């Protein structure tokens, strides 16, 4: 055949049947599967269903951890409805609180679950894909090597009965592309690498009721909006930090407040930090956590440059802090420029939203090309609390960059809160669907 590259290409455009079998039981989170869903998805031009399945509530707590035959039968049914409509289907292990909380303790039960799944579907055609663990987090975030070791063990279990089926594997940080460099894979030739994409979280998860506190809404997304460079998260504290038009406004609202960008990936090869403020600002500059900061005072409209060796001297720059050098709050100012400099080409930390999407997909593609692995972006979507035009813009921009890079993908999700199909009106949410299938 064509190998794993062709299997990934055949994944093509896909959609998640979410809020369904990955809840503790089907319908617990609002979506019960129906046969007509598969037909609608096929008719809308998707080639693939991703089927999130949380198995732990359906398996014995004691060895041999047998999965409920009725639940297994429901997964059988979904596999059948996909296949009979000419769709691919990705079967995963999705939510698994116990495993993320204690990988070592829960390992045997998880591996038994995978052995049951792999043996049960061993004779399915190449249109059926396995996905070892959705979004590893918890202890896996603390020690990524736990996930590297576990995924290798689970892969060996799967390969005992499925010697060549495509197996989808992602990094920790909830399948964050920024943690790809911590992922380590065995030399198995039939692996597809996955990441999920929700940047910027302030927009895609605005109004998320599952968080405490609930993030604010009314966040708009536009290609030309200001943004931080891809992968630099706003970890600021004690401050109002935000783009207003072309300007990054910083209000230090308390003593020692900090403007703080953090990257899970980090960067190498820079030796200086350059920035410019609209007013003279007295700062503590730090580019390495728990390292000594350097005191600097800028002047309005005039660039200041600081050698990284003098404010923490990191080898891999992951944390960048401009801290209010004062026990009191400070009036708002504009950060007009912020860029890293080195022997090579500078890194502008301030950019625009569209370019941030492109930068993220370029980073993933560089990883995938270096490691010679195909890429499937198994989840991306913007929550319904955002205004629809912004969601359409974001969704189409993301899908476009994905396909420009020949990433296969699966939108989150078919129905419910990220949904593209309105089950009440029994109609597609047309502009969002068109963002995915133009």
Residue numbers in the entry: 15 to 452
Quote what the paper states about this structure.
Initial attempts to crystallize wild-type MtGlu5 failed. Instead, the inactive mutant E393Q (dubbed iMtGlu5) was first crystallized in a suitable form for structure determination. The CDs of two iMtGlu5 molecules were correctly located in the monoclinic P21 unit cell. The initial map showed some density outside the CD regions, and amino-acid residues corresponding to the CBM were manually placed, followed by computational refinement and new map calculations. Notably, the inserted CBM is not a fixed attachment, as its orientation varies with respect to the CD in the monoclinic and tetragonal crystals of iMtGlu5 and MtGlu5. The CBMs of the two iMtGlu5 molecules differ by a rigid-body rotation of 22.5°, and they differ from that of wild-type MtGlu5 by rotations of 25.3° and 10.8°. While large-scale conformational changes are often observed in enzymes upon substrate binding, the moderate flexibility of CBM in MtGlu5 probably allows switching between different orientations of polysaccharide chains. Because the CMC titrant and its molar concentration of binding sites are unknown, the n value was modified to 1 together with adjusting the concentration of the titrant. The data show that iMtGlu5 has a strong affinity for the recognition of long single polysaccharide chains with K d = 5.71 × 10−6.
Here, by solving the crystal structure, it is shown that MtGlu5 from Meiothermus taiwanensis WR-220, a GH5-family endo-β-1,4-glucanase (EC 3.2.1.4), has a bipartite architecture consisting of a Cel5A-like catalytic domain with a (β/α)8 TIM-barrel fold and an inserted CBM29-like noncatalytic domain with a β-jelly-roll fold. MtGlu5 contains a Cel5A-like CD similar to TmCel5A from Thermotoga maritima, but has an additional novel domain inserted into an internal site in the CD. Unlike other known cellulases with CBMs at the termini, this inserted CBM in the newly identified MtGlu5 acts in synergy with the CD, as demonstrated by ITC experiments.
